[PDB]
Design a protein around this ligand. Structure first.
Ligand SMILES: [Zn+2]
Lengths: 196, 53, 49, 201, 202, 87, 50, 470
DNA sequence: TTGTGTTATTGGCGTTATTAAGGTAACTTGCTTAT
DNA sequence: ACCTTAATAACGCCAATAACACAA
DNA sequence: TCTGACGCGGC
DNA sequence: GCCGCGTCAGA
């Protein structure tokens, strides 16, 4: 917008309110994954590649442009492959065939779930409650809380323990997330591909 | 013995039932047998019945 | 050693390459390979994938 | 249960093979034979355009070899000429129609006496061109049909169809533009089918 | 599981498939083939024969066995007769309807450009229908005891030809005992258009 | 070639992820409690992922060799080998 | 270990007594391609002409 | 402060206890605010003609669905239309119908006031009110559908102007696209389509009233009033977020963690605020805890398990549990099911034999086993529904056996008959009347042929060898 | 080889036991769970 | 923790119909 | 425990 | 342009 602000300019709530006061429309500063996704979306490459390669043609990489070297490679790769860079923010995530997370019944008239069933059963009803809320037009605070709880469950499903205090079941064990199956000595590569 | 169902048996199984008049039993046995490589005798047989009956 | 030889006679030699060997550890030279499958099996799977 | 035929016609001899498969009451009758002018007239009474072949029962008469073969199959549960899986059935149908339109129509055309030079030439060119693709797709279809059920003693009709296409290709002095040893050896082995001998003689 | 059908507007076989699918007591996504991106439209099928299908692992287009594949893939109450001889006759009837029907719609659509040409065709259409009136009477929908596929076949020549200024029920001779018995079917009553409006157009 | 001879990795667009999906999951259900059959459209929905037995829908109606590629209509179950519940 | 076809195939070849082997691909690798595909990553077989 | 702390519960509690707790004065003030907002939107709704005729029409639909009952001694009961107004309802409706007829014929001011006052007599809380506001909205929705559609149909073809909108946008005309002969959009099919759509547009208006500006402003005023009410209710609900967290301290480990507990609470609260009228002098805090508790316990009973379980089966279980504890801590002994039933509203003696058979949440496959040779349960479950390479080798040894056994039987016939009538490499396993046609004869002695084949096959020359496979 | 007797199924019917939904108006307002 | 109600899917019914059998 | 590769903040 | 203090990744 014509407003003198900067695109990647973090604004606190009250400073944002003052921007709204003095300029009203002509600029949007949203919060949440939609914000990041919109940014990555409206991020032209050819506007940026050469503009940065020229700052690197101003090579004084003693401490400053020892940083700008990688962004070259990243932006070149994203051009070379053909991948939309906004794809790094999911909008629909897939599920795994059931016979890779079975629920077979075993002795004692009991069953043996897999830890993935639980994380799935959580992300699902959190998405459901979110849709119901967005429907009923609730206040934005609980909208925020749901939209954040959802991100938390998704991260737990992918690999819990990367950022928080990874969730546990009744037995109080840190659950065996998705990524936690294809790493480690007990994982999938050096356990059942070179094991057998 | 334990019961079962859902045969819908193969055509050949059907034929061979139909030759010797072989009926298809709905039950299957799961007994208790000493595993191979063992022998011996018996010294005590504890049996616990049902409740409230 | 391949791209140098690509230029070496195709165009003219087109001023191919000047380099200098560098010494890196065994783990460092292990993960730094080409095949992403073997590297991904070795260790630090998340990062390489 | 009668089938009017006419020698020198790929359609009639195709349905003849299909019948001899069942060996059913092939009460065969020709058309161009002067010993049955009356019954030729009869056919002309029971059909608009006197198309050959034509299957007649005490219930109806039919034409358009697609309908003919499908009615035969509706009629005889003899070792069959079709898959069991709806998708494979539909694919067989479509491929049959394709090879039909693209080859048998031209064959009927160059069966004419009033032909031209350029016409026969270009037609034989296209046939020599597309035979290879037809054969390849057909053997592929055969394989994939068979994997889903083995030892089924069921005959794939499209193989017979391509057999008769090749046989007429021979019977009209044209070249088959291949160089594969596999192609030609399987061709010849195919032509040597026992119950297939029953008619070509 | 899921299955959708891509269709265009004002096509005989498109409506044919629509009615058949509606009959099978099923549920499908209906997408009008005109609302997609042109490059996307063509990338669907690079040739383009709009009424096709969409299943998870298959895509069928050729409008000769399509209805057959429908009749076979969901054997929910059939669209083909149970008794074999009827099964044989009806397919040849389908051949009659198919092999020679181009001038009935295509020519009156494109080649008949003079109103004189159109009406000169119309007289022949009327007289051909009259010549056809000396045929089936009282039959349920066709030569049959119950509902068949040809029933779902003539509905296209009904609707699309009604859309060509050819309303003919009593100005059609004596084919009216079923041509009105036809539209007493739920599925065929998808041809064209207060509380009823809000309730129905959803 | 009949044998693949390279392997490549890449990001999945939301249009590839749908292309992989044989359905969609809507309610957090796994298996009925009293009888142990799968539930309608949960995390074991036999209509999406596949049947349970071989050549047999869930409601057990379409159970005969006459109909193999057939799709039942009481339950949305297909009819095919259970070996697809893993792919 | 884990070639579903090959298991029964070889156990058949033995009891009969002929020579043949079919070794298409193991199962654990398909399981891996699934588990990685259950993320936004697209691992897949392919062909190359360059 | 906003200091990188990740766990959301704090990032929610912080904002939660920000705005101040209020007193009965403020509560009743915002309550009368929402009430007058609702009465504004209500009154401003029914000042349009077609509203009441559509109301009467829906009553006619209920009339026919009521006549559909004696086909199977009162007016057939269905009052899902109005809440807390059937003889009075029906009679009032009759008056409504007739007086509305006279209204649509003669008058200008009086009888309109009469009908709005008899509506003032009625009582509808939020359901039917929204039913009416949609009665108004949905028509505008559909006409806007058709507008967007005609745009998308023409604008990306008709020279792609996209900025000469003011000239084309004149709606309900069908007089603009004819100059388009001397303009773009060679769109004959599209021409008849947009003419069909504009026909339906004018037809909808005819059903309702004059042009779009007859409804646009109605919807605008409705949006405004509704935004007032929404802000009022939002201020109301934001004042007592702490009540939720306070009550949600008891249910804390029964199966759900805390956040979703809180969310279910907030749902049950937001649903509570709009059905609580100040008309009675009371405390919002008293009545709202009912709804909070309902929501929390319902969600708990819903998603506290993997294998879902109906809610009645769960409250009965809770009842059994309380009884069991009461007796254990009273008489020492444990179960004595005779006593469990000897004083119980369960009113059954077999459900108990099942109500507690589902009393084991599934163990998780990834529980190590302490020492126990250092393994886990997730490697003792095994494949049970397949055919082990022996279970699938004793089959082809039979699948091919009889395929040869028969090859030493009939010349060809009984082979054909057994194949067709049993199904071997066939597709259907045909029936007697099918083979009956296969050979053109023998509708009956085909059965005789199969009987002969079978009596010929049960000879120790061919029988006892196969007898193993059974 | 053609007549007269079953039968096995199979859509229709009702029946109801089981599941899902909704509603109470004396006043009630912020854990952090632990080498 | 307790109701008070519609709504749904399993379960029992006896006829129809397509198929099978059994004496000359 | 460590040993480091790699940081990314005070000055 | 650097002296200390972090996280991650394997033991
Ligand atoms: Zn089913």
């Amino acid at each position: 917008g014509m407003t003198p602000l900067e695109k990647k300019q973090l604004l606190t709530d009250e400073e944002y309110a003052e921007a709204l006061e003095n300029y009203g429309y002509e600029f949007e500063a949203s919060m949440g994954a939609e914000a990041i996704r919109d940014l990555l979306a409206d991020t032209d490459i050819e506007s940026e590649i050469e503009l940065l390669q020229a700052e690197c043609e101003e090579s004084k990489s003693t401490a400053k442009k020892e940083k700008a070297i990688k962004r070259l490679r990243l932006l070149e790769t994203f051009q070379a492959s053909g991948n939309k860079p906004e794809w790094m923010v999911m909008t629909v995530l897939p599920v795994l065939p059931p016979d890779l997370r079975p629920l077979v019944p075993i002795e004692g008239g009991r069953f043996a779930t897999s830890d993935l069933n639980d994380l799935y059963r959580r992300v699902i009803n959190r998405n459901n409650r979110l849709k119901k809320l967005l429907d009923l037009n609730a206040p934005d605070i609980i909208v925020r809380n749901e939209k954040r709880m959802l991100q938390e469950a998704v991260d737990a499903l992918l690999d819990n323990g990367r950022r928080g205090r990874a969730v546990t079941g009744s037995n109080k064990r840190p659950l065996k997330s998705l990524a936690d199956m294809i790493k480690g000595k007990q994982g999938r590569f050096r356990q059942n591909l070179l094991g057998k | 013995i334990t019961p079962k169902a859902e045969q819908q048996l193969t055509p050949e199984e059907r034929l061979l039932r139909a030759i010797f008049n072989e009926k298809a039993s709905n039950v299957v046995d799961s007994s208790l047998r000493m595993p191979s490589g063992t022998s011996g005798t018996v010294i005590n047989v504890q049996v616990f019945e049902n409740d409230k009956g | 050693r391949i791209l140098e030889e690509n230029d070496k006679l195709r165009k003219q030699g087109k001023k191919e390459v000047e380099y200098e060997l560098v010494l890196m550890g065994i783990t460092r030279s292990s993960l730094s390979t080409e095949s992403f499958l073997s590297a991904a099996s070795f260790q630090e799977t998340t990062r390489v994938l | 249960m009668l089938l009017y035929t006419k020698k020198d016609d790929i359609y009639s001899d195709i349905v003849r093979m299909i019948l001899l498969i069942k060996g059913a009451n092939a009460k065969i009758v020709d058309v161009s034979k002067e010993e049955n002018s009356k019954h030729l007239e009869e056919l002309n009474i029971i059909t608009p355009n006197g198309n050959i072949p034509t299957l007649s029962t005490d219930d109806f008469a039919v034409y358009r070899l697609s309908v003919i073969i499908e009615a035969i199959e509706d009629l005889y549960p003899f070792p069959p000429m079709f898959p069991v899986f709806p998708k494979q059935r539909a694919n067989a149908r479509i491929l049959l129609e394709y090879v039909n339109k693209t080859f048998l129509q031209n064959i009927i055309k160059l069966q004419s006496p009033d032909l031209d030079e350029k016409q026969a030439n270009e037609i034989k060119m296209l046939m020599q061109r597309d035979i290879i693709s037809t054969y390849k797709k057909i053997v592929s279809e055969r394989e994939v049909n068979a994997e889903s059920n083995p030892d089924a003693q069921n005959i794939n009709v499209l193989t017979l169809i391509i057999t008769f296409v090749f046989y007429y290709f021979i019977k009209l002095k044209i070249s088959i533009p291949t160089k594969d040893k596999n192609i030609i050896k399987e061709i010849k082995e195919l032509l040597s089918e026992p119950n297939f001998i029953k008619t070509i003689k | 599981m899921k299955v959708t059908l891509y269709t265009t507007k004002y096509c005989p076989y498109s409506l044919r498939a629509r009615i058949a699918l509606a009959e099978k007591k099923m549920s499908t996504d209906i997408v009008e083939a005109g609302d997609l991106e042109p490059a996307m439209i063509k990338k669907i099928t690079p040739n383009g024969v709009f009424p096709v299908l969409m299943e998870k692992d298959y895509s069928i287009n050729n409008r000769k066995a399509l209805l057959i594949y429908i009749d076979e893939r969901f054997p929910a109450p059939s669209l083909l007769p149970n008794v074999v001889n009827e099964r044989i006759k009806i397919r040849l009837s389908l051949d009659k309807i198919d092999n020679e029907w181009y001038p009935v719609l295509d020519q009156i659509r494109k080649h008949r450009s003079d109103q004189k040409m159109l009406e000169s065709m119309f007289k022949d259409l009327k007289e051909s229908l009259l010549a056809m009136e000396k045929a089936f009477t009282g039959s349920e929908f066709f030569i049959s005891s119950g509902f068949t596929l040809a029933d779902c076949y003539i509905a296209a020549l009904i609707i699309c030809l009604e859309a060509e200024g050819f309303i003919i029920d009593d100005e059609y001779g004596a084919i009216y005992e079923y041509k009105k018995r036809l539209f007493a079917r739920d599925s065929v009553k998808k041809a064209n258009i207060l509380l009823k409006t809000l309730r129905t157009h959803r | 070639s009949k044998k693949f001879d390279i392997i490549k990795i890449s990001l999945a667009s939301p249009e590839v992820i749908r292309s992989w999906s044989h359905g969609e999951v809507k309610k957090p259900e796994t298996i009925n409690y009293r009888t142990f059959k799968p539930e309608r459209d949960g995390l074991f929905c036999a209509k999406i992922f596949g049947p349970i037995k071989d050549y047999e829908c869930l409601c057990g109606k379409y159970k005969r060799l006459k109909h193999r590629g057939v799709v039942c209509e009481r339950c949305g179950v297909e009819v095919e080998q259970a070996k697809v519940r893993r792919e | 270990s884990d070639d579903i076809a090959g298991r029964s195939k070889m156990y058949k070849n033995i009891v009969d007594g002929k020579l043949t082997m079919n070794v298409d691909v193991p199962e654990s690798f398909n399981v891996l391609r699934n588990e990685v595909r259950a993320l936004g990553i697209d691992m897949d077989f392919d062909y190359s002409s360059e | 402060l906003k200091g990188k702390t990740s766990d959301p519960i704090r990032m929610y509690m912080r904002e939660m206890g920000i705005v101040d707790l209020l007193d009965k004065k403020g509560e009743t003030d915002i309550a009368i605010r929402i009430e007058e907002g609702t009465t504004e939107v209500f009154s401003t709704i029914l000042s349009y003609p077609i509203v009441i005729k559509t109301y009467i029409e829906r009553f006619r639909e209920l009339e026919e669905k009521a006549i559909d009952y004696m086909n199977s001694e009162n007016e057939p009961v269905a009052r899902y239309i109005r809440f807390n107004e059937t003889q009075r309802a029906y009679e009032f409706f009759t008056n409504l119908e007739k007086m509305f007829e006279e209204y649509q014929d003669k008058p200008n001011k009086k009888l309109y006031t009469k009908i709005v006052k008899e509506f003032d007599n009625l009582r509808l809380s939020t359901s039917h009110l929204q039913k009416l506001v949609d009665y108004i909205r949905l028509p505008y929705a559909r006409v806007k559908e058709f507008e967007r559609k005609i745009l998308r149909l023409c604008v990306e073809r008709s020279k792609t102007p996209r900025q000469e909108f003011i000239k084309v946008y004149k709606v309900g005309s069908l007089e603009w696209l004819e100059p388009l002969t001397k303009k773009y959009k060679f769109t004959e099919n599209t021409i008849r389509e947009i003419k069909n759509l504009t026909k339906q547009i004018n037809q909808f208006q005819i059903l309702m009233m004059m042009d779009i500006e007859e409804l646009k402003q109605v919807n605008l005023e409705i949006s405004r009033s509704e935004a007032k009410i929404t802000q009022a209710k939002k201020e109301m609900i934001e004042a007592n977020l702490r009540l939720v967290v306070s009550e949600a301290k008891k249910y804390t480990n029964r199966g759900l963690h805390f956040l979703d507990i809180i969310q279910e609470g907030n749902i049950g609260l937001m649903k509570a605020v709009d059905k609580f009228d100040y008309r009675k002098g009371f405390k919002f805090s008293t009545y709202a805890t009912w709804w909070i508790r309902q929501a929390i316990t319902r969600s708990i009973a819903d998603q506290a398990r993997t294998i879902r379980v109906p809610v009645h089966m769960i409250e009965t279980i809770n009842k059994v549990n309380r009884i069991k504890r009461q007796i254990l801590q009273e008489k020492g002994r444990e179960a004595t099911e005779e006593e469990i039933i000897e004083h119980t509203p369960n009113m059954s003696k077999e459900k108990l034999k099942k109500i507690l058979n589902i009393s084991h949440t599934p163990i998780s496959m990834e529980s190590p086993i302490g020492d126990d040779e250092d393994s886990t349960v997730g490697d003792f479950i095994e494949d049970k529904n397949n055919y082990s390479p022996i279970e699938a080798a004793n089959l082809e040894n039979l699948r091919e056996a009889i395929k040869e056994l028969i090859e030493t039987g009939l010349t060809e016939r009984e082979a054909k008959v057994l194949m067709m009538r049993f199904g071997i490499g066939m597709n259907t396993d045909h029936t007697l009347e099918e083979v009956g046609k296969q050979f053109n004869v023998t509708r009956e002695r085909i059965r005789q042929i199969e009987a002969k084949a079978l009596r010929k096959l049960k000879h120790p020359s061919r029988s006892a060898f196969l007898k193993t496979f059974l």
